[PDB]
Design a protein around this ligand. Structure first.
Ligand code: A1IWA
Ligand code: K
Ligand code: K
Ligand code: K
Ligand code: K
Ligand code: K
Ligand code: K
Ligand code: K
Ligand code: K
Ligand code: MG
Ligand code: MG
Ligand code: MG
Ligand code: MG
Ligand code: MG
Ligand code: MG
Ligand code: MG
Ligand code: MG
Ligand code: MG
Ligand code: MG
Ligand code: MG
Ligand code: MG
Ligand code: MG
Ligand code: MG
Ligand code: MG
Ligand code: MG
Ligand code: MG
Ligand code: MG
Ligand code: MG
Ligand code: MG
Ligand code: MG
Ligand code: MG
Ligand code: MG
Ligand code: MG
Ligand code: MG
Ligand code: MG
Ligand code: MG
Ligand code: MG
Ligand code: MG
Ligand code: MG
Ligand code: MG
Ligand code: MG
Ligand code: MG
Ligand code: MG
Ligand code: MG
Ligand code: MG
Ligand code: MG
Ligand code: MG
Ligand code: MG
Ligand code: MG
Ligand code: MG
Ligand code: MG
Ligand code: MG
Ligand code: MG
Ligand code: MG
Ligand code: MG
Ligand code: MG
Ligand code: MG
Ligand code: MG
Ligand code: MG
Ligand code: MG
Ligand code: MG
Ligand code: MG
Ligand code: MG
Ligand code: MG
Ligand code: MG
Ligand code: MG
Ligand code: MG
Ligand code: MG
Ligand code: NA
Ligand code: NA
Ligand code: NA
Ligand code: NA
Ligand code: NA
Ligand code: NA
Lengths: 186, 404
RNA sequence: AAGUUUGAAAAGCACUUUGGAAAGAGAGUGAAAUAGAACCUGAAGUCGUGACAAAGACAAUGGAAGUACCUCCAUUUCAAC
RNA sequence: GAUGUGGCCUGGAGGUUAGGACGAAGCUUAUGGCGUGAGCCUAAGAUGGACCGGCCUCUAGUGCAGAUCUUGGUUGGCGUAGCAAAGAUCUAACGGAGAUAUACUCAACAUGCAACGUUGGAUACUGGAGCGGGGAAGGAUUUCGUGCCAACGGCACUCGUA
RNA sequence: UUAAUGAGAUUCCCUCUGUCCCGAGUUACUAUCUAGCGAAACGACAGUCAAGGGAACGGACUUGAAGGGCUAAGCGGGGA
RNA sequence: CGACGUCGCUUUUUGAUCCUUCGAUGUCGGCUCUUCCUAACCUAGCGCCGCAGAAGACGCUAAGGGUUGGAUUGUUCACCCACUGACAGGGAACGUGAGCUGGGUUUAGACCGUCGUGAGACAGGUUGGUUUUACCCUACUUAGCUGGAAAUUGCGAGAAAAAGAUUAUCCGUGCAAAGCGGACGUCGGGUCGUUGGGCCUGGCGAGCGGUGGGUAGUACAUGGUACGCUCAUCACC
RNA sequence: GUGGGAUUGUGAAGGGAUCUCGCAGGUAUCGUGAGGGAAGUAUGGGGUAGUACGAGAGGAACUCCCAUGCCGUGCCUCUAGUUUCUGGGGUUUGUCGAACGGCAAGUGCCCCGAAGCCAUCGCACGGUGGUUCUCGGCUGAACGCCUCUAAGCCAGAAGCCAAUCCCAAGACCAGAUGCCCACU
RNA sequence: UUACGUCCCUCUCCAAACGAGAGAACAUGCAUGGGCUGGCAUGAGCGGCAUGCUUCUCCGGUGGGGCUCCGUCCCGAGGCGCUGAACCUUGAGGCCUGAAAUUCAUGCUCAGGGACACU
RNA sequence: AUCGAAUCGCCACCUACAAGACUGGAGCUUGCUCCCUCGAAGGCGCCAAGUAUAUUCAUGAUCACAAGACA
């Protein structure tokens, strides 16, 4: 990043102080606007209030007007090294109009990149069950959706500086994909 | 020897070079001629292309076969959220062209206006206009602003305002850009003192499109066309295709020049960039200046068709989304794809024609699905055709029995 | 097509260190390894590198006169010489 | 085109006079000097390692920029044209130096990539006029096992008709 | 002269069509970018034009007009 | 309009010549594509007529724009059918073959007529007869990076600027006027050089402000800014 | 002055000298517009009008209005085309024991088919002032009269120039602005 | 030669041969799901006078032929019902989390990394 | 801050304008006469801040880029 935000240059303690500086400055401005909107909405007449719909966060099925969705997310903390996730990959949307003879090999690379982005790993092992499922209808009959189980594990080659993570991706057979969302399994 | 038969040359040599436009936004190269007898007014506005549909109206022109008869006209819908005026600039005439005298900035500028000065705003220090804010409102700052304003009164013949779009108000998910589009809008009409008075009164204020244009007027469109990358001579210039027998290819120009001059002329069609060119388009009749759906929901309702509809077609505008702001319905088409910012300019050609003077009254606005042969104008019309479906029974049965 | 023409003598580089190896870095022999095995001498052409000179587009080169800067070049002078 | 030149240069011979291990020949040059010139001579080598200069005469396979000249080497084009018929490979494990290869910071991604052989699975091709199993002609050790990877198999190899 | 026969030469009709009006869209393999590998042809020197003369059709010459440098993909006007 | 004569222009015809090319400049026609000329067919104006009107003739300025679809023929030409405002004529190596095509022309096979004793010949007819190469330099079309006014240097100083103790020694207003209207103070120190001297700096205040705390209504398109009051802080200082 | 490097080839570690280079600009917007390009061009109908003119026969034009041809610049709402969304269905031969799911026939084949692309096969838009030619005139001499000219003027062509439109500062913009930094 | 900042890596697509461009920079940003819009045309399975379907008790329920032991079980293309069902719907990149109306949920991110700016 | 340089006329009186067939102003006689500021000077600057009572200049040795230059 830019020199003014580098973690190595600023240091851990300085970086934390600046991040809280932005947080408190933005959070305080949100509380000011919440109070003012709470105040002027009550003051305004019911005839005028029909025009102002959703302004004071009164509306249903609505985002929080004050702040971003991400800022309201609860940052629990670092995930454990050994974590298991179950997810669906919409393979058909990644293979639209691809060359027929490369569909199954391309699906393997797409799955490895999908998991690699999620788990931040470069060593992504494909289990036999997942490989069989991808190829079970031929090189060009790849299924539109796949349900995978992602398991991240830690093991480093002795004498290496940086700890080494790797994932094992296996197929999860499902009768239907409807209603299936991404879950952290145990 | 002379060519055996004559035909007009392919393409317009005045639109050269056929290169990529310097900017993605439409910019007016000239403004309509200033006439001092009119009250001061703005001459341009920035809009966003949402999509296309068609309307029905009666034709008023006498002597035509379609007089007092209905016609169907394709229209383009362009979203026009209000614009914010942030600055004033003055120009003085010199023997080598107009020179900017100075810039009077507003006391407060929006965050999305200051984002235009950054390549990575969220990770920056966000110090734009921080020293200008501290210098302004001081004893020396107030004097400097007054001196610049007096210089405009004494030496300026052209007064323009600095305006920017509001991407927060647009609330479009596919537009992507969060930094405002900045442009200069010339203040035409009145004396130079009167022009400065209006520009000062507009500082830090919102300007709506309906205060710049009227419903039945025409306007010019400055925009950049859709890009196609590298294209051959057949598509780029419209030359004929060679016979199937041709060796080494058909989609070519057979002779790219005579022996002498021993050169290829600039008038010969060659492959290269096609599209993404700036174009100023003339005489686009405004058919409707719509209000925001939060204020008036019945945008597509007319006096003849009483159905309560918005301007947004069933299923949304393809690749754009919902029109949530004020909008302009221009007759016909404009250059460029959806999501692209465009400039509407007050017309520069004479507007004395019967077609240009005609008062437009819309009788029907189509809101059917732009996805695959829309046959319903509203969601209620679709419900009446199908009635209850299997998924409606499941949703109702669970609510009727499990929840009650 | 091809001189095995290294060196007087093989004294043909033990040993240490990095490298999977090829090799590199050291250390040794020898008067000389820039004499290390198709090994005397080692040209031209072409190329790499460091230093410097600068230089628009007049293709470059060239001629004649100067000048700026350099010069491991030559010669002369250095007391009333 | 003719002729002249105590005019220049090269390999040898008969004479004469010199030089060289304190460095001959050859080679190198912003080494200068001499000559109108061909050239001659000196300086330096942080070059070389054993022969050789001047002068008189004699002698000849005696002087190169070009002959689509000969032979050897080099070279811009150029990391370019391309290496696109015969459909195709994927996965885990094992093997291998061929890796998970890191100053600081730093939990992992954003700093060791890409490539090999075998086995098990998967997928596909040949489709009996077969990339099946045997012979003639031709070839002659290419057969087999182990080892090995400098060159070669126009990419690669830990594999091989090397 | 001639039935039958003909990858023989010719004319017309039916059918049929992207041959054409008049082009548009899509696929595989390329081109294109990368890793590895890696040539040839050709090569006096070079390479912006106008006119002029000139071995009568110049990249060099005269007089004018251009011309900041280096690059990727194409292209077939010139390089007689 | 123009006999008998006479004076010219042009190089889109042929002829005359033999300067260039024979260690090679690819031959006709068509297709495609661009540009140029004007001796003007149509389109814009304008004169004149054996000019009533309509339709035309002749002429001038003007080449910006336009100038077609087909049957036969390899054709260029020619001719006919048809549309049109009109269907003008030409150049660009008889533009254009590393752009195409290859019907003709003009190799070798073969047939006919005429000629020749013959082999063979024929600007006579006929049929069949390989169309190669760009990755170089320019040109052109798009597409990137990039310095530079002494067009890389000199320090070689030129503003389509201001208007003054020589631009210093304040800000407005006015005509480069006459005038006129404004300006934060105070108490000390240090440090250099003719008048309440320049500069640096500290303490008390005040004012114009920038941010944040607490608060009230209002504006604007309505989440997000501004504005009143009041605290804290920073800056001019 | 200060900062950073280096010097000529037979050794090492230290000292001088002498050279070269850096020492104030970066980064992000909005504009100017020199120069270059340059585009719109034709026809028909209505009406004028069976009018002007003419013995008759015949038979016009401008203002204005409405269409259209060619050309140009775009666009995808509609209509049409295109399908490797092999989307959803059918359907033939082979094949996994059958059903299911499918698979092979280099996209098996057939019908329909979104999005995207695309057609004068669809749709939209295509403008203003001057300077002059040719020519017709005014005033008016030379030449007491006369004469468009000779000194002056007027009017004036699809030509030409500029506006509009496209590229645009090697056209080196002392054009205007946002932030740092440098100087102060 | 400090700061502002720029670029590469990463993500998006109005751009795009490669460069370049437009953007984003913990952001409903991305992912999956739901709903919408639309495409095709009624999935698998099971079953016929009920044990099924439909409707608030009332409706509805085949088949040319054939085989066993009038009646009963069975074989049988096709038909009917559950079923405008099943499947697909953003991907080179349709909509909805900001009008009102089941019309939107849930996961993921945990100091962004690198290089210049900087003789 | 390298940096030593080439350049040798200043101004707040020129730094406004226009016409040479007539631009100092009149007359009538229209090319002569008359009046005036008499129609041919931007102002300063060149060694006593002003025309005089004065005052340091060397040896920088006879030319050498003025050895110095904020007028
Ligand atoms: C038959 C016949 C007549 O037509 C031609 C056609 C071409 C040629 C060739 C010559 N043209 C110029 C040069 O002299 C030669 O070029 C070359 C490549 O040889 C001669 C006659
Ligand atoms: K002599
Ligand atoms: K050779
Ligand atoms: K020849
Ligand atoms: K005419
Ligand atoms: K013949
Ligand atoms: K111009
Ligand atoms: K022009
Ligand atoms: K510039
Ligand atoms: Mg012609
Ligand atoms: Mg032609
Ligand atoms: Mg021709
Ligand atoms: Mg061919
Ligand atoms: Mg061929
Ligand atoms: Mg659609
Ligand atoms: Mg020794
Ligand atoms: Mg040696
Ligand atoms: Mg030796
Ligand atoms: Mg040797
Ligand atoms: Mg050499
Ligand atoms: Mg060298
Ligand atoms: Mg030259
Ligand atoms: Mg010299
Ligand atoms: Mg001999
Ligand atoms: Mg001797
Ligand atoms: Mg030397
Ligand atoms: Mg040399
Ligand atoms: Mg000699
Ligand atoms: Mg010889
Ligand atoms: Mg030689
Ligand atoms: Mg040769
Ligand atoms: Mg090479
Ligand atoms: Mg290549
Ligand atoms: Mg090939
Ligand atoms: Mg193959
Ligand atoms: Mg395997
Ligand atoms: Mg790593
Ligand atoms: Mg690896
Ligand atoms: Mg098969
Ligand atoms: Mg097969
Ligand atoms: Mg068989
Ligand atoms: Mg076989
Ligand atoms: Mg073997
Ligand atoms: Mg190989
Ligand atoms: Mg020329
Ligand atoms: Mg060529
Ligand atoms: Mg080519
Ligand atoms: Mg002739
Ligand atoms: Mg000849
Ligand atoms: Mg040739
Ligand atoms: Mg030749
Ligand atoms: Mg040629
Ligand atoms: Mg003419
Ligand atoms: Mg013309
Ligand atoms: Mg023309
Ligand atoms: Mg020709
Ligand atoms: Mg000719
Ligand atoms: Mg050819
Ligand atoms: Mg030809
Ligand atoms: Mg050619
Ligand atoms: Mg032929
Ligand atoms: Mg005979
Ligand atoms: Mg023939
Ligand atoms: Mg023949
Ligand atoms: Mg044949
Ligand atoms: Mg310079
Ligand atoms: Mg098979
Ligand atoms: Mg279809
Ligand atoms: Na593809
Ligand atoms: Na390839
Ligand atoms: Na035959
Ligand atoms: Na030449
Ligand atoms: Na020249
Ligand atoms: Na369609």
């Amino acid at each position: 990043t830019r020199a003014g935000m580098k973690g190595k240059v600023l240091g851990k303690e300085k970086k934390a102080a600046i991040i809280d500086a932005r947080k408190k400055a933005a959070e305080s401005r949100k509380n000011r606007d919440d109070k003012r909107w709470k105040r002027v909405l009550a003051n305004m007449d019911e005839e005028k209030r029909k025009k102002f719909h959703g302004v004071g966060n009164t509306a249903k099925n609505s985002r929080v007007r004050g702040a971003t969705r991400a800022s309201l997310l609860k940052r629990t903390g670092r995930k454990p090294d050994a974590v298991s996730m179950e997810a669906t990959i919409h393979l058909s949307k990644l293979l639209k109009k691809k060359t027929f003879s490369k569909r199954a090999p391309l699906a393997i690379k797409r799955i490895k990149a999908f998991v690699g982005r999620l788990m931040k790993t470069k060593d992504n092992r494909i289990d036999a069950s997942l490989n069989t499922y991808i190829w079970h209808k031929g090189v060009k009959g790849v299924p539109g959706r796949v349900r995978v189980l992602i398991q991240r594990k830690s093991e480093t080659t002795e004498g290496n500086k940086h700890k080494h993570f790797y994932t094992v991706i296996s197929n999860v057979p499902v009768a239907s994909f409807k209603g299936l969302t991404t879950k952290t399994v145990e | 020897s002379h060519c055996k038969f004559e035909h007009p040359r392919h393409g317009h040599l005045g639109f050269l070079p056929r290169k990529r436009s310097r900017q993605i936004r439409g910019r007016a190269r000239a403004f309509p001629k200033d006439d001092a007898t009119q009250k001061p007014h703005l001459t341009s506005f920035m809009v966003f292309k949402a999509g296309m549909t068609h309307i029905v109206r009666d034709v008023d022109r006498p002597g035509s076969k379609v007089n007092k008869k209905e016609v169907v006209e394709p229209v383009t819908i362009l979203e026009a959220p209000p614009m914010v005026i942030v600055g004033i600039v003055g120009y003085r005439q010199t023997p080598v062209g107009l020179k900017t005298i100075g810039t009077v900035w507003a006391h407060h500028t929006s965050v999305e206006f200051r984002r235009r000065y950054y390549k990575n705003w969220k990770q920056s220090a966000q110090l734009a206009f921080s020293r200008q804010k501290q210098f302004a409102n001081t004893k020396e700052g107030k004097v400097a602003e007054a001196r610049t304003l007096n210089a405009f009164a004494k030496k300026a013949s052209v007064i323009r305002v600095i305006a920017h779009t509001q991407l927060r108000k647009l609330r479009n998910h596919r537009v992507g850009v969060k930094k405002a589009h900045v442009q200069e809008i010339q203040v035409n009409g009145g004396s130079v003192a009167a022009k400065i008075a209006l520009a000062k009164s507009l500082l830090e204020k919102e300007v709506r499109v309906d205060s710049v244009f009227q419903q039945s007027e025409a306007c010019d469109v400055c925009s950049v066309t859709k890009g196609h990358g590298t294209e051959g001579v057949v598509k780029r210039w419209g030359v004929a295709c060679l016979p199937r027998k041709t060796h080494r290819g058909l989609r070519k120009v057979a002779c790219i020049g005579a022996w002498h001059p021993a050169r290829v002329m600039y008038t010969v069609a060659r492959a290269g960039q096609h599209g993404y060119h700036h174009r100023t388009q003339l005489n686009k009749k405004i058919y409707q200046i719509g209000r925001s759906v939060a204020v008036e929901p019945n945008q597509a309702t007319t006096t003849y068709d009483l159905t309560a509809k918005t301007i947004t077609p069933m299923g949304g505008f393809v690749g754009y989304g919902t029109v949530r702001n004020d909008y302009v319905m221009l007759k016909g088409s404009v250059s460029g794809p959806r999501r692209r910012v465009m400039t509407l300019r007050r017309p520069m050609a004479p507007q004395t024609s019967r077609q240009l003077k005609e008062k437009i009254v819309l009788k029907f606005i189509d809101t059917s699905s732009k996805i695959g042969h829309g046959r319903f104008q509203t969601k209620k019309e679709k419900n009446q055709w199908f009635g209850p479906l299997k998924k409606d029974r499941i949703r109702r049965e669970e609510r009727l029995r499990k929840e009650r």
